[PDB]
């Protein structure tokens, strides 16, 4: 006997038969060819296409967390930060506690805008040969014309540096981890897996909050919609958005008084610091398992309701943080209605979000910080909003609670399988309607296969038009649990409390 | 007089608003120790007293 293996007797045969090219670049359409050469007689019955997506952008909206009355966590936080600022600024101050908190929320929307345009500037340096989505797909997902950023690099750099210089002239506490959380989410690129051909997660604000001081009936934060993906917006549009954001704050006396008071209370080492940007500044896609766990359990709440929204049967449901001194004893009030999808109709997919959510985690041992960070983008409906009128085309919902930000949409950027193989923009909620047409089933299947390329992708709740039936969470579960509205509301009420937290005076 | 001559500045409340705030604080602390006693009694076991808890 010899008892040596065949692969050890001829290792050259094995190493020659298995030399294959791997690491195909993504961002590029690939045609697989035919194994049966005669199968071109079957036109669409043979799928020879292979498109890999690269960008899924989480479209979000910063919130204070469901204010109903003066006992809300943002009003308790307003009380604590005004007690801290007031007993560090001995003198005569004219603003209330809620004017100070609304100044802090407008400061947050400014910092999100600055990190947004800085991400537009810092993405455009990204190149790698093995991912062709860099950097144009990431710029398409942020709503900017990518050629405008390359052609006007110095004007863009001046604009973002002047946004940092202007918006950085107002003080905000860095002891609040609210600003640090939005800076963490809003200027980071996140891979779904620690590989080089990984797929990118991003966070883009759907809307920001514009201050809008009015009359004598307090203040009223109103939405300012950001560019959506596929819009080829240029630098002048972002300049108009910036000037619309700080129109009521630049060179304003009351905002300067509040900024100097926050400067004197929290010292210069205890304020937030905006980041500068040059031609050297670039961000690299990092692996963060805390980001992926809350992208996984994210639930999209729909489009923001504006003044120009024409909700049939739902007047006055526009999203606004209000501070009327004659209403609710002068409490900061924010309770938006969810389930709006931009149009004046029912959107039957939101019925699929009326079941209890699934909280899915990797591993088998879960920390309390891990569990509470994995639930930060989740938002469950609790009741239906009451239709005021005879008929009502849409159906709105009221949650039990939400965190410092709600998800509005997701935007997936892939390549088209038809020539010239340009990028494709697909915007979706967690819920997806498939109406009865032949051009919807294979397209929905393509979208589902595109979504399952993303590792900790949000859980899908599809529904069918002729089946009258929603299917549950389309996601691979590892170690799951069923959450109810009260548990998630407890976690939201904990996290809104922790984000708006300041120390004491001693 | 103690709080006013440690908080140099303009205060709007009277002496009696401060004392009523202190009494309401006492009722809050009694409520907290009450529900904490509800929570801390429920651990008590002994075989020789079946009234626990």
From Swiss-Prot, chain A:
The keyword Acetylation applies. Signal peptide: none annotated. Picobirnavirus particles are capable of disrupting biological membranes in vitro. Homodimer. The capsid protein self-assembles to form an icosahedral capsid with a T=2 symmetry made of 120 subunits. Pfam families: PBV_CP (PF20816). The record marks 22-23 as: Cleavage. It comes from Human picobirnavirus (strain Human/Thailand/Hy005102/-). Keywords: Acetylation, Capsid protein, T=3 icosahedral capsid protein, Virion. InterPro entries: CP_picobirnavirus, CP_picobirnavirus_sf. GO terms for cellular component: T=3 icosahedral viral capsid. The keyword Acetylation applies. This is Capsid protein precursor. Gene3D superfamilies: 1.20.140.120. The 7 kDa polypeptide is acetylated.
